[PDB]
Ligand binder design. Structure first.
Ligand SMILES: OC[C@H]1O[C@@H](O)[C@H](O)[C@@H](O)[C@H]1O
Ligand SMILES: OC[C@H]1O[C@@H](O)[C@H](O)[C@@H](O)[C@H]1O
Ligand SMILES: OC[C@H]1O[C@@H](O)[C@H](O)[C@@H](O)[C@H]1O
Ligand SMILES: OC[C@H]1O[C@@H](O)[C@H](O)[C@@H](O)[C@H]1O
Ligand code: NA
Ligand code: NA
Ligand code: NA
Ligand code: NA
Ligand code: NA
Ligand code: NA
Ligand code: NA
Ligand code: NA
Ligand code: NA
Ligand code: NA
Lengths: 987, 987
């Protein structure tokens, strides 16, 4: 046997869970001496095991080819190799347990000093290594690590020396473990979490298991704190000063009156567990979880999960998320009404749990297991059902549970994600149920739900969710399993996929969640986009995605699919989600005399809120103030009278004059996660402006050689289009039926014989390449000598027989311009045997000047489409042109403001005003073809023009990239239509 | 009605065949004064009718914005606008008869002088205007033209002035006529054929209709020459000096003994038809066409059509083909055994016919009609069935027939191409049959063949052609139509689509054509690639295709689909076609004592040929000479003894020594189309070399730290691959299963539930991204202390479970290296539910040095794949590296030499020799990924390496871009395989 590297590769191809580590235990804050070894290490990268040197480097002499690297790190984020993104597909041939030849091997080394406090006994702790580590201390092999987001500890007693020590870690990117770590995220090798030296004093505490239940009938806590050393129960004293408790470890007691823990009221009691040589600090939250009557209950009450799936990602540091970023993003979640987190799809940093305990989230804590890439071969060779993987998979679940078992915020254990079905998942479940019966088990991969306590699905349609909510879903074939599952509460562990413009359809899910007790709620996919910061030539920063790093196989921008960008800037979808899940419902009376208030919280009353009202009209705020609301109990509702001045305004206002009454619930005092005045919920009553009044057509049409003039409008006799309106240059006016496809429009709509993405249906139909033919121009009798001008056109596409006849009828009294647009189908809009859907029925004005400011009356300030925009409230808004856009990583249709009644564009010295029955408003400095063609934001370029879109109809955006497409009521099928606009130019 | 251009557009949207022209007539050479107005004209381009100026330009004063342009021209070939390519799809919305707003309008003007010989009567002739012309002379509108490849004449009597005249022509690119001119070719507006002034003397001859039949029983000609003036029969004298004839026009006579016209013997008699004021010169070919017993017969004999479809294209002049290019390309056709031409899909230049008469081609003369783009809407609005188009379509057929009716070479009239079915096609057929019953009618669009005389199909499979050949195809539903069609002879008006690497499957068609009398033969699609010369930045010329000129809709390189490139350089497919259709069959005896000779001609014996033999061995030609063959009658065969020295050589040669006997039929004397010695047919008998002798494995394996040495081979212990062989640096050695897709591999294979193109099946399966894992390296006992080296690998692709185990076993005696390769499937090669086919089973050697020369024993000199290479004969060949490639416009797999037994690559100072059982040999200066990625030839770049491909198996190339894919016997399904090679390096 003559090839090199055979021994290294045999270890990497091992089915075992690594070797030499201490037993799995909790992460515990203790008074034992601790030394962080984080800092600047030395690093050397080789392309595979067979050429990785065996040159004595572990002794830190002859450091040929090492350079400085921070640890913790995801090494490709610091110029060593490159990040690589795949969703489902493995980036290596699928032949477990074998590894590819191209397998980055990273050799890490650090020299440190240990004082006498680390003797005689100490350990080394590694909180994460992707994917396989071998650890040496002073040349002595301690062992190996498997389970990339799991902790490993190694005893260094007798190996650690007083004074200088040399720690060496060889890390392989790929190993047999990669076959069970196929999460949809970047592949990023490294020592990416803390490395810590911990003294282990005699008579200490190795592990602690807190049991802190709550009896909602009596108000009592039920407390038992187990403590062990070396795997044996030990005498320790547990002290809980706030509850006046001093008790022995290992004894169960009843605490007469505790305040229970929930995400809404995350009450924690400080406790210490003390042995003669070591003391552990704990935060204890008393809460009990029960499944009863097909409901998921905490402390005796059904809860509603308002969740997100949280990955660990940083755009410049990879899997290393700095603590201040964690703290800020959790506050941002609370500020957007989120109360639940799924740790997709692996345990988080160990210090994450205390923050979730403190700030208050219901946490689904998920084991590091996903074998999704085996699905394409019908799950042949799936690790989850292969006996050779049993010890490895049970070890993952054991380490997951042991680390985090003391945290009140963890309300469910999850076995993993998209790992199919099989005997090893059943083993993991059995192990967990035996070890910790206090928490229900979650796993979506096995729909029969045989080895779980809740029924979990991902992206089940609103329709199917409604059936499950009513308990009337189709039965399993096994009647015993059906009876069990039909009696389980139901959770969407992932739903309303938040990629790009979207997600649509959130309100239809939320109405079900709030109506049906069996529906626990849902976790959006996902919290964050995994953008990675890159720069073009000339150094414009932007986010990159799959394929931007030279990957042979990748999944493009499917990793940029979140509610916030990688720097935690909200996408519009987060603003809408906040409103959809708001925990108070405020229904303002149409006569402005009061509002109905529903408290949708599970435990807290409304005493934390201040209730504010404001009345706004075109001239500004007319009135505002606070109203005193007696605290409303959870799940209750009341009517609140508004002060009489508000109704008096409603009475006085002229008919047709717009006015907006807004009632808001804000924090009355600072919380841990937001300041006093932070808005939690709102409701509105709107007095809509009257429909626009088209002008009297008293101005005649003036005929020149090549132009026509009608009041302030000049028209080309060659095209029938205006060339200027009140001095504003017009380069083009035409009908629009299409938009630059969203990420959702690039997804297939499963169901229906046509499974082309909508973007492809549009391209096949020519909707992205429409052309206009002029049929005629004629003047007609107006009023008092005036005339109207009718321009008749037909819109179609090359090689197609279907079209729409579009008639524009222009009128003017010299100041206001009336524009009537009439659209009539000419031939059936069917292509390749399927009906052609439209994006919109609208007009595109291309103006020959740049727009500085856009103002409108409608919804805002952010974008809104028919099935989104919940967070866009009624009002008057004004934005610089640049802020009308949405900085999605792949540019796509975005920025429409649906429900507009009036708009004003400032174009230098003139203002173009537009009024209509509800229309969508979009304004861009580049064309739709530039938007569509652009793959990254630097591809967008302003051309000195204004592209103004006025839509009479729009389709929704749905979630077709993953899950339901646009629901029927928001789809736009071809139809005939007519609509009126008025236009005015002020100088 | 206020829009501009309404009158111009109404004329362009007219269904009528234009106006003001003289009656259609023949193109006739006459002694009447003629003046060509070709030369430098003045030209002005406008973007559409509505802005085209009406500024008096037709009077040639105030020439604001005109510049010089040659006429004839296709104006986009001279920098005015751009060529645009579509295949089927129309480049404008389909709403006949309406035209798009973007419609290039070209205003042409020339001033010329007319002498007194053009008075009192003269006409102006236009032999082609694409697509709509309006003609003025001295400001007087003469009329308009429709039918872009048809002639129009206008009477200028009373309008032409003695002295200076001003001719003005406004030409619109698009008109209602564009809907009936949807040929797959470039859209190219212009005045693209001759413009001629012709005097019309009193007592002249306006039209002539030659009727020249042949009675094959008596050998007599049957002659009647009709002559008219002003639509009335006239007294004229017909003189045919060579036949001693002086006869009256309008009288039918029997000529006692003529020599009949055929493509093989294109006998023409010079004749003159004379009235008092004008004389016409004619070339008369006596031939009669008959359909009898389901056979297409000329002069009493069934013929075999060896055809091509000929478009008119020039890479720099567009639809203008210079006469010297026409003459040369026709000679090139004859030089490649072609005897028939279809004028796809419009009449050719009027002077083309005399050349076809003279050089000898059977011509299918096709009317300018194609409505293919209506098929996508189920032929809704198809002009061919719309009564409004009847006069326009009958006018096209009338002008087609009248122009060319006197030419012996025209043996069938065709109504058009891909125009569906309908009443107007039936009218065209009825008109033609009434006017000229001497020629059968062709039209493939109506398979029922109700209004035609032959059954025509395009790209019918070899299988279906065999059924039709035997008269056993499925019946039509109408038994009367079935009886008629089953009694028709059958022609493939298009077959073996010649796009890119290919066409495969030609031999299977040819065997049928020669076996079954009902099969008339076939016309390849097509003669030429319509490449257009363009240049990159830095000025490297290359051909462009669809999309290279900014087209919104286009069909890419589907216009580069010919046997020759646009400059008439042969593609390999033409060299193979020449051999497939060779009109003599030479079958050399295996004992080299003689050959069987079949004369496959229809009329001529073999007396025109000299029969040559040559014997070649490794050292060169051993013997050669001529053999006297008594002339063999058409459709007969004989055995010819070879001189005894040839057999004596066969006897003397050592067993296993390679030797090639070639017998060739060459022209014994110059012809009109080639020189004496031009090769027409050949046959060979080959004494194959013995299989290679692997060396005795007497050399041991030497083990170094990171390398192994086995005789002259050095191996990496990290990869198992050789790093040098006899000092030749080796960068990579690995298995190949894939090739850079051909144009055919990009086509769908209709039939079978999998209609992905093969290229897509390969991409989905990862065949374009294979990776290799090393399993082990070990030495084994050899002979006399020597050892063999076995390297075990596995080849697969990321995210796939299927692989192939590949074992390489190396041996050496210090000079020769033996390489045994064993391939074993590991898992089923099925992806997406369908079996994955392979391109090949071979090896890729990447050498670290450039190759100057490639020599081999096998077939050549050009490329050969399993279902091609008919023209590649056995022999020894040697080419510079650059000449191994094939300059297809879109680079793709090409250049393999199948059937190789030995190869030698000169790499500077060393020669690498390879021997094997038959293998395919390819050598390139760039990798397969560069080849695949390249869209035009300048994308290819040499990287300083040599890419050497040795294939044990290859698949065929088929014709899947249009018509049959690879036939079953040439497909390469996954299998297990083993093969031996020997390698030697000479310095
Ligand atoms: O973004 C697509 C998503 O699809 C789900 O099936 C998966 O569980 C998620 O991890 C993510 O990949
Ligand atoms: O102010 C009410 C709060 O209720 C919590 O349960 C939630 O996590 C917060 O996001 C906020 O909605
Ligand atoms: O190259 C594809 C070919 O397809 C045929 O159907 C057509 O008759 C030809 O003109 C050419 O378009
Ligand atoms: O030399 C025989 C010749 O026969 C003709 O019919 C044919 O057009 C030529 O290409 C050549 O084959
Ligand atoms: Na619920
Ligand atoms: Na994703
Ligand atoms: Na209050
Ligand atoms: Na809204
Ligand atoms: Na885009
Ligand atoms: Na035949
Ligand atoms: Na073509
Ligand atoms: Na002879
Ligand atoms: Na051959
Ligand atoms: Na290519």
């Amino acid at each position: 046997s003559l090839e090199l590297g055979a021994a290294d590769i045999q270890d990497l191809e091992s089915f075992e869970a690594g070797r030499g580590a201490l037993p799995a235990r909790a992460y515990l804050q203790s008074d034992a001496p601790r030394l962080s070894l984080n800092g600047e290490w030395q690093f050397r990268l080789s392309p595979g095991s067979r050429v990785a040197p065996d040159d004595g480097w572990q002794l830190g002499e002859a450091l040929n080819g090492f350079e400085s690297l921070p640890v913790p790190s995801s090494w490709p984020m610091h110029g060593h190799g490159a990040p690589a993104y795949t969703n489902v597909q493995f980036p290596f041939a699928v032949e477990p347990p074998h590894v590819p030849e191209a397998n980055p091997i990273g050799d890490h080394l650090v020299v440190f000093e240990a004082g006498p406090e680390f003797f005689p006994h100490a350990l080394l702790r590694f909180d994460g290594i992707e994917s396989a580590g071998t650890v040496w201390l002073n040349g002595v092999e301690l062992g190996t690590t498997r389970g990339s987001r799991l902790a490993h500890e190694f005893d260094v007693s007798g190996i650690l020396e007083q004074g200088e020590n040399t720690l060496a870690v060889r890390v392989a990117q790929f190993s047999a473990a990669s076959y069970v770590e196929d999460q949809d995220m970047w592949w990023l090798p490294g020592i990416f979490r803390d490395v810590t030296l911990q003294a282990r004093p005699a008579a200490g505490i190795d592990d602690v298991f807190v049991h802190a239940g709550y009896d909602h009938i009596t108000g009592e806590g039920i407390l038992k704190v187990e403590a062990s050393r070396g795997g044996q129960a030990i005498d320790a004293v547990v002290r809980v000063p706030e509850l006046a408790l001093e008790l022995a470890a290992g004894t169960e007691v009843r605490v007469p009156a505790v305040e229970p823990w929930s995400a809404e009221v995350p009450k924690l009691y400080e406790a210490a567990v003390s042995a003669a040589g070591e003391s552990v600090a704990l935060q204890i939250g008393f809460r009990s979880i029960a499944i009863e009557d097909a409901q998921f209950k905490v402390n005796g009450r059904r809860i509603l999960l308002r969740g997100v799936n949280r990955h660990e990602h940083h755009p410049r540091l990879g899997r290393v998320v700095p603590r201040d970023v964690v703290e800020a993003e959790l506050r941002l979640m609370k500020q957007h009404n989120i109360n639940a987190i799924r740790t997709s799809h692996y345990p988080p940093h160990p210090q994450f749990l205390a923050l979730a305990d403190q700030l208050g989230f219901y946490v689904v804590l998920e084991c590091d297991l996903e074998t999704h890439g085996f699905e394409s071969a019908g799950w042949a060779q799936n690790p989850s059902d292969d006996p050779q993987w049993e010890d490895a998979l049970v070890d993952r679940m054991r380490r997951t549970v042991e680390r985090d078992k003391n945290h009140a915020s963890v309300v469910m254990w999850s076995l993993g994600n998209e790992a199919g079905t099989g005997r090893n998942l059943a083993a993991m479940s059995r192990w967990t149920k035996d070890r910790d019966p206090s928490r229900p088990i979650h796993y979506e991969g096995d729909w029969s739900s045989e080895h779980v306590d809740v029924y979990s699905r991902m992206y089940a349609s609103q329709a199917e969710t409604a059936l499950i909510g009513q308990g009337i879903e189709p039965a399993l074939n096994d009647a015993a399993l059906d009876a069990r599952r039909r009696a389980m509460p139901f959770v969407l562990c992932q739903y309303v996929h938040a990629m790009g413009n979207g997600p649509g359809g959130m309100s239809e899910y939320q109405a079900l969640f709030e109506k049906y007790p069996r529906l626990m709620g849902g976790f959006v996919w996902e919290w964050l986009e995994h953008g990675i910061t890159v720069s073009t030539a000339d150094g414009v920063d932007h986010y990159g995605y799959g394929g931007d790093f030279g990957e042979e196989v990748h999944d493009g921008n499917f990793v940029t699919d979140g509610l916030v960008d990688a720097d935690r800037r909200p996408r519009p979808g987060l603003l809408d989600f906040k409103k959809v899940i708001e925990p108070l419902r405020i229904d303002v009376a149409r006569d402005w005399t009061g509002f109905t208030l529903r408290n949708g919280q599970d435990f807290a009353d409304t005493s934390a809120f201040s209730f504010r009202y404001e009345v706004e009209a075109d001239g500004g705020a007319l009135d505002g103030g606070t109203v005193d609301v007696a605290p409303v109990a959870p799940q209750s509702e009341t009517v609140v009278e508004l002060p009489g001045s508000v109704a008096a305004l409603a009475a006085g206002l002229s008919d047709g004059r717009p006015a907006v009454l807004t009632v808001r619930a804000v924090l009355g005092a600072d919380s841990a996660w937001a300041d006093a005045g932070h808005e939690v919920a709102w409701g509105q009553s709107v007095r809509e402006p009257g429909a626009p009044v088209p002008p009297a057509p008293v101005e005649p049409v003036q005929v020149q050689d090549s132009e026509l003039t009608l009041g302030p409008v000049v028209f080309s006799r060659a095209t029938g289009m205006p060339t200027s309106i009140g001095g504003v240059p017009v380069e083009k006016l035409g009908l629009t039926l299409w938009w630059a496809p969203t990420d959702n429009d690039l997804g297939r709509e499963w169901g229906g014989a046509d499974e082309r993405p909508l973007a492809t249906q549009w391209k096949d139909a020519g909707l992205n390449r429409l052309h206009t033919r002029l049929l005629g121009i004629s003047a007609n009798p107006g009023q008092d000598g005036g005339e109207t001008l009718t321009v008749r056109t037909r819109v179609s596409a090359a090689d197609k027989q279907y079209g729409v006849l579009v008639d524009y009828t222009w009128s003017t009294d010299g100041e206001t311009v009336g524009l009537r647009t009439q659209v009539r189908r000419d031939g059936t809009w069917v292509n390749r045997g399927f009906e052609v859907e439209w994006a919109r029925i609208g007009l595109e004005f291309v103006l020959g000047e740049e727009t500085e400011l856009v103002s409108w009356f409608g919804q805002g300030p952010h974008q809104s489409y028919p099935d989104t925009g919940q967070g866009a409230r009624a009002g008057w808004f004004s934005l610089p042109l640049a802020k009308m856009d949405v900085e999605y990583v792949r540019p796509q249709e975005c920025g429409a403001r649906s429900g507009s009644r009036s708009a004003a564009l400032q174009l230098g010295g003139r203002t173009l005003e537009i009024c209509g029955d509800p229309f969508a408003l979009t304004v861009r400095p580049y064309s739709q073809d530039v938007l569509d063609a652009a793959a990254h934001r630097p591809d967008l370029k302003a051309d000195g023009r204004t592209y103004l879109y006025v839509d009479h109809a729009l389709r929704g955006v749905g979630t077709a990239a993953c899950g339901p497409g646009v629901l029927e009521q928001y789809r736009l099928k071809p139809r005939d239509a007519d609509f009126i606009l008025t236009l005015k130019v002020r100088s």
